[PDB]
Q: What sequence folds into this?
RNA sequence: UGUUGGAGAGUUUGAUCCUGGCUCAGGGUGAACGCUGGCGGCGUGCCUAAGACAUGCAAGUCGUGCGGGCCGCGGGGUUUUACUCCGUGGUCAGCGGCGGACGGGUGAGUAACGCGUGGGUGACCUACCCGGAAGAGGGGGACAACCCGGGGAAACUCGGGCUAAUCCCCCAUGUGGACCCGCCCCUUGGGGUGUGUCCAAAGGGCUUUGCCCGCUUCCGGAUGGGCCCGCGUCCCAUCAGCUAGUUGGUGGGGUAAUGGCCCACCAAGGCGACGACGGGUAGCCGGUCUGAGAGGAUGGCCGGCCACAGGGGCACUGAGACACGGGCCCCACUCCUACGGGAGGCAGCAGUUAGGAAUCUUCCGCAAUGGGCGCAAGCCUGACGGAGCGACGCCGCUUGGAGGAAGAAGCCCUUCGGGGUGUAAACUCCUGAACCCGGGACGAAACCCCCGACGAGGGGACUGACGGUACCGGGGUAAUAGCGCCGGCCAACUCCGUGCCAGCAGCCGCGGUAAUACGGAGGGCGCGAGCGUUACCCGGAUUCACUGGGCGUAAAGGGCGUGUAGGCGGCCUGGGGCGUCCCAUGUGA
């Protein structure tokens, strides 16, 4: 049970806009709209020049809270990375962005990640045919990520794809709104991702 | 109790006295076969050798000595004698002594 | 293959027996400096041919007692008290360390 | 007796054996002599038996006695079909 | 044993710098304690009393080796009688073959060729299995069972008599082999050869002129193992000298084989500062943890090796034992005892009790993999395959998802306008773990039987513990959260209480009436079925420094010299080529 509870206070703590709700966090109400100061009884007071540790920290809780993963699943992937050939940095993201519960977000099947986490749980998604209710499942290059046949008829899902009619997809994905299907072309490269992050810092945090 | 594995310790004994006796014999026949040669009685010591010698390979046939326990005995005795018969003897029967 | 070692006799006191000194040489497990250590092996002289300070070679063989498991192949220089004198001179020292108390 | 038997390596409910050659004496899970292949009873991956006819035969000619089970498997490979024709 | 690798801070001062110890942040744990605790997968779970253990179970198997006792069904011979012959099912024990030397436990002991690594055996053994040669002739005997009697409180023991076989023994036979001795080729007991001597054996079973099983000797393969050697293996020199079978030698004993392994005699040596001897500690390794690496720490699970099975000694039988569930004696211990004498050993699975901060079910299965015995059917097998208990660890899973006001209530703060918890809840809609229905398997194919030739191959049939479990299909409800911290290192701040008190504390310290450092509240950071704590290992610690430190005054130059072992060594050429470097290869499971 990772977090689950108030979100926008997270958005307000990192000081940057986080899309942890899909809709709304777009219309005048993600709080960061006329109230970008942190939560608590001192969110409005003045902030003191952060410690090298504070920055590295804040920057992590960001990268992570965007995907809503336990610091646990978070870490272990970091390691996976560290070990793989390539720039620790992006290699990290690549994987992070390879999570089914996530891919289901990018492909649009759901308004945002958390919801996608769920859809995966309740078995409304499929990979190569055999459904998968596992959020942390790593999508490999060449795997169709379709909607559960018995789910293609749910209002919520139809609603989602209905509005995708037009929304382009990451050049590392592609979908077939008709057959409500969509492939994972290839691991998205750091550029391809527009994250308000500085993974050169997350990295630095786990170097302590 | 009563694992009926005491049968093994029941056979053994029957085999203890079994072995014990053939060997003991071999020994006796061996030594006795010596004494003679030592003294000089030509034949009488070879004649006994054969028997002695035999007993060996006989106790050896089974599992009293087996292996090369039937190779020291033999060779060893076939020396003490021959050699103890190095006080002017001339193996007349030269039985167990390829001369 | 049976190992051959080359050393220097150092005692012919026993019968059909010779005490040979094998100096070996190796770098440190943790300091790489080169180093010398030595071992006394007890080999057999069935001919009493090898005498004090002769530099011999040695081979593994049928144990022939507690400690002796080597032999004396053949010579390598029939004379060198130069080194025997070292060993003999090392011992001579012990004879004088601790106890005796030259102070009493 | 050097015998060709199976050895357990997989984990709990996913057993994976080995056509090892050994002493009935050791435990069919300890040191061995060589490996003649494997077999996964479960039958998931297209590759099951992997018995190396070659070596198999050789241990057999030496006296390695295969279990009833070790046999069935070597028989599926061909550790037993000695070339014939013109007549069958 | 991998190839992207290395963050520091606090603290001795009025202030500074250096030194230098203490301290923290990290990671790991067969863990324990606290608070809390929803599911699953795999893993793992006495680390202390190698203390003591009740009961059950952990090695047996073969009637195609053999003969009987017993309960039973059936068939003969003496026309009805006692008697007796045959077949046969079950059964019990015995004689005998093979297994009990594997598998399973523990780590006490051991600093040792115990282990690791690599070699040696012209110094060796190896049941069963496999290939190849040759053979299986004749004869004789016993001990059990069973029958009689005797001793015993038992445990159990003794004497008396009969009988069988693949049990024992003698003779014959010998492809051969063993030994002595002569010789040859090798070269420490390798191989070949000569006359002499010595040595084999059993039968059982059926579809009976056929074949299955078995048996004897011998050479080879196979595997396993003994022995030996180089090298490598902690701490203390306030342990410095140890040693008499101890060092060697010859003869002999013993063993499968070398050997002081054992004995007799002769010689007197062997080991030691390149640490003998002694004390302490410790099973060793593949590997594990940590670390930038070098290194350090460790060796529980799995695997290989060793050692032990109440303490100690010893041998019998066997290919193998000096034999965990075998045997003999002594010791201690509990137990039966008519006290004369006997009985046991969980460091096997499971449980008990003691100890302890602490460690589980007296389970199910023999379906599978494996081992044992058997022609086979099959028997056995807490080995193993599994299930249970423990958040003990790791990995996945949930407590919901979108929407939802310049913003409820409440609680907090608020030089009192308002800020905060907070879109958090309410409320709406969507999805739907649990739970219910029906379906439910992989792990299982052969051994057997039939055709075939008893091959090859083909045909047939039985076969589950886990399970009615996992998993699939349908219906389906929003349906556990906690815990640590928020002075500095270390991310998180106000108020109220308390007043050097009560109390915090890892270091520095905080509290004596404004405390961001005590306690509660609100809030906040962290992590989440977990979080804190304690203990111990590595890290930080270049704080033992090989990589990587030091000694004028900070800890550190021996008061000086002489000189031993040792370490180190100018210039030129040539041999070796030990070190050193390189290539190949074997080993490095
Ligand atoms: Mg979560
Ligand atoms: Mg944070
Ligand atoms: Mg989402
Ligand atoms: Mg018994
Ligand atoms: Mg007996
Ligand atoms: Mg002999
Ligand atoms: Mg040296
Ligand atoms: Mg010696
Ligand atoms: Mg095994
Ligand atoms: Mg590598
Ligand atoms: Mg001060
Ligand atoms: Mg009989
Ligand atoms: Mg009766
Ligand atoms: Mg009649
Ligand atoms: Mg019975
Ligand atoms: Mg019986
Ligand atoms: Mg064992
Ligand atoms: Mg070795
Ligand atoms: Mg001659
Ligand atoms: Mg020899
Ligand atoms: Mg370091
Ligand atoms: Mg026991
Ligand atoms: Mg079986
Ligand atoms: Mg059978
Ligand atoms: Mg582990
Ligand atoms: Mg519904
Ligand atoms: Mg260090
Ligand atoms: Mg220093
Ligand atoms: Mg020079
Ligand atoms: Mg060289
Ligand atoms: Zn937001």
A:
């Amino acid at each position: 049970g990772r977090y689950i509870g108030p979100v926008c206070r997270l958005c307000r703590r990192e000081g940057v806009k986080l899309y942890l709700k899909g809709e709304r966090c777009y219309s005048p109400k993600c709080a960061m709209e006329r109230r970008p100061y942190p939560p608590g009884q001192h969110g409005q007071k003045r902030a003191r020049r952060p410690s090298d540790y504070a920055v590295r920290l804040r920057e992590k809780q960001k990268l992570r809270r965007i995907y809503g993963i336990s610091e646990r699943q978070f870490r272990n992937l970091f390691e996976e990375a560290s070990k793989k050939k390539g720039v620790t940095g992006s290699v990290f993201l690549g994987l992070l962005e390879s999570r089914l519960d996530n891919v289901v977000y990018r492909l649009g099947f759901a308004v945002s990640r958390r919801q996608a986490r769920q859809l995966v749980r309740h078995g409304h998604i499929t990979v190569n045919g055999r459904r998968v209710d596992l959020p942390s499942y790593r999508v490999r290059p060449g795997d169709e990520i379709a909607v559960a046949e018995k789910s293609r008829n749910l209002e919520l899902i139809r609603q989602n794809l209905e509005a995708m009619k037009g929304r382009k997809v990451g050049p590392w994905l592609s979908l077939d709104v008709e057959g409500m299907k969509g492939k994972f072309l290839r691991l998205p490269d750091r550029e391809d991702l527009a994250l308000p992050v500085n993974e050169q810092l997350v990295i630095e945090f786990y170097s302590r | 109790r009563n694992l009926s594995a005491l049968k093994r310790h029941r056979q053994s004994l029957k085999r203890r006295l079994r072995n014990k006796a053939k060997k003991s014999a071999i020994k006796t026949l061996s030594k006795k076969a010596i004494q003679l040669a030592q003294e000089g009685k030509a034949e009488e010591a070879l004649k006994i050798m054969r028997k002695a010698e035999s007993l060996i390979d006989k106790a050896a046939k089974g599992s009293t000595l087996h292996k090369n326990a039937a190779a020291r005995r033999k060779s060893r005795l076939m020396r003490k004698v021959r050699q103890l018969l190095e006080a002017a003897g001339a193996p007349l029967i030269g039985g167990g002594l390829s001369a | 293959p049976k190992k051959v070692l080359t050393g220097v006799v150092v005692s012919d006191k026993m019968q059909k027996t010779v005490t040979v000194l094998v100096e070996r040489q190796f770098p440190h497990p943790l300091y790489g400096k080169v180093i010398k250590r030595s071992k006394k092996y007890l080999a057999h002289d069935p001919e009493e041919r090898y005498k004090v300070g002769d530099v011999v070679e040695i081979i593994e063989a049928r144990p022939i007692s507690k400690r002796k498991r080597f032999r004396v192949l053949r010579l390598v220089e029939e004379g060198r008290l130069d080194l025997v004198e070292k060993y003999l001179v090392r011992r001579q020292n012990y004879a004088s360390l601790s106890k005796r108390g030259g102070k009493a | 007796m050097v015998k060709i038997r199976l050895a357990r390596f997989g984990s709990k409910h996913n057993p994976h054996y080995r056509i090892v050659v050994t002493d009935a004496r050791r435990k069919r899970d300890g040191k061995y002599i060589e490996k003649i292949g494997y077999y996964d009873p479960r039958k998931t991956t297209p590759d099951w038996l992997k018995v190396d006819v070659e070596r198999a035969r050789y241990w057999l000619s030496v006296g390695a006695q295969p279990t009833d089970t070790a046999r069935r498997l070597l028989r599926q490979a061909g550790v037993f079909r000695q070339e014939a024709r013109e007549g069958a």
Observations:
- Chains D and B do not touch (no CB pair under 8 Å).
- Residues B 56, 70-75 surround magnesium ion (ligand 6) (CB under 6 Å).
- Helices of chain D lie at 53-62, 68-77.
- The two ends of chain D are 36 Å apart (CA to CA).
